[PDB]
Amino acid sequence: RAKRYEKLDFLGEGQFATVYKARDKNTNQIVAIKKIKLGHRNRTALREIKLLQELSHPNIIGLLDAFGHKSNISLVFDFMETDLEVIIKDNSLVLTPSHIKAYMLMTLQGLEYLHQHRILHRDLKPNNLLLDENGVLKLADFGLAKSFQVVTRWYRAPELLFGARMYGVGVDMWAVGCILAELLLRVPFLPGDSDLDQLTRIFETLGTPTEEQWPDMCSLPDYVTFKSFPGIPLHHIFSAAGDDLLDLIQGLFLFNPCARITATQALKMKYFSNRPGPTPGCQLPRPNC
Numbered sequence: 001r002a003k004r005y006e007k008l009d010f011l012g013e014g015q016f017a018t019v020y021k022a023r024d025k026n027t028n029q030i031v032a033i034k035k036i037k038l039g040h041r042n043r044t045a046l047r048e049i050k051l052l053q054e055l056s057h058p059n060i061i062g063l064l065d066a067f068g069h070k071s072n073i074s075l076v077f078d079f080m081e082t083d084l085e086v087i088i089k090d091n092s093l094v095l096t097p098s099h100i101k102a103y104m105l106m107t108l109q110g111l112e113y114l115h116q117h118r119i120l121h122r123d124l125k126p127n128n129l130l131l132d133e134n135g136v137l138k139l140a141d142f143g144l145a146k147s148f149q150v151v152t153r154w155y156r157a158p159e160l161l162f163g164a165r166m167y168g169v170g171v172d173m174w175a176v177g178c179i180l181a182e183l184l185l186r187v188p189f190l191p192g193d194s195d196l197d198q199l200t201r202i203f204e205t206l207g208t209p210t211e212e213q214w215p216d217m218c219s220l221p222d223y224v225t226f227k228s229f230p231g232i233p234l235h236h237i238f239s240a241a242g243d244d245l246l247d248l249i250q251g252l253f254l255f256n257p258c259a260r261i262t263a264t265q266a267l268k269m270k271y272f273s274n275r276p277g278p279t280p281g282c283q284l285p286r287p288n289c
């Protein structure tokens, strides 16, 4: 499983990881190796493989083989054609309501599954939702994921920005909300230049929160008193969205994290049972190469 795979294209440098297209020199499937190059620890990177092998799901990335002795450790995976991030930036593609319903659907079934199995994918962003031949979306980058201030600032839920130590599933949900806005607007919704500014963005956009809207807000370790903004109505931001969708977004971007709509609460919502339903993955937009 070391020399086994022959290197094709580069796919991504990373956080402490590189990713390569390679060809299994036996199966002849294209595969995506995650190199986790290291030194101290492979504690977090072993835990990853662990958490991974423990999951079977069509919207969860498929752990095929890990291997390798040296400075590095390799996780083999099914190759994927694009990520939801490129799918955004590709202008070629204009997005349809039923395209997004479809992208959201598969994301949240992935999520439902995960949180049933008591896990957090603490790093949900749109380059981490991959898509195959047949428009089947999959979560990935599990290097940040514990079994019940970590995401990349734009998709960081507030509680975290306010240095919450003990935090729940409402973390993953904030992200999914950020990803939906980003899907709608086709640009990062709340692109802070700093943690401090990421909160400014959140509040000025969504309004600064009450102790009603969020009790136990001030008890957070890094809590700090921002200016009080009113917020912006969602149908201003999303002149797009119909009321079934607005309802959903607004619930995902609730401030109180036990009052934040769970994956299931969200999958059990009109939006999904309402027309237009999800495009078949096979009929979902594909980009240039």
Ligand SMILES: *[C@H](CC(=O)N1CC[C@H](OC(=O)N2CCC(Nc3cc(C)nc4c(C(C)C)cnn34)CC2)C1)CN(C)C
Residues within 6 Å of the ligand: 011, 012, 019, 032, 033, 034, 061, 077, 078, 079, 080, 081, 082, 083, 086, 130, 140, 287, 288, 289
């Ligand atoms: C057309 C080729 C095509 O459609 N391209 C345009 C957009 C595609 O480029 C991307 O951004 N891709 C392709 C590579 C894909 N691989 C990738 C990246 C990362 C970071 N992780 C992973 C995994 C994990 C499971 C490890 C798997 N695959 N990746 C990212 C998106 C290329 C071809 N003709 C014939 C139609």
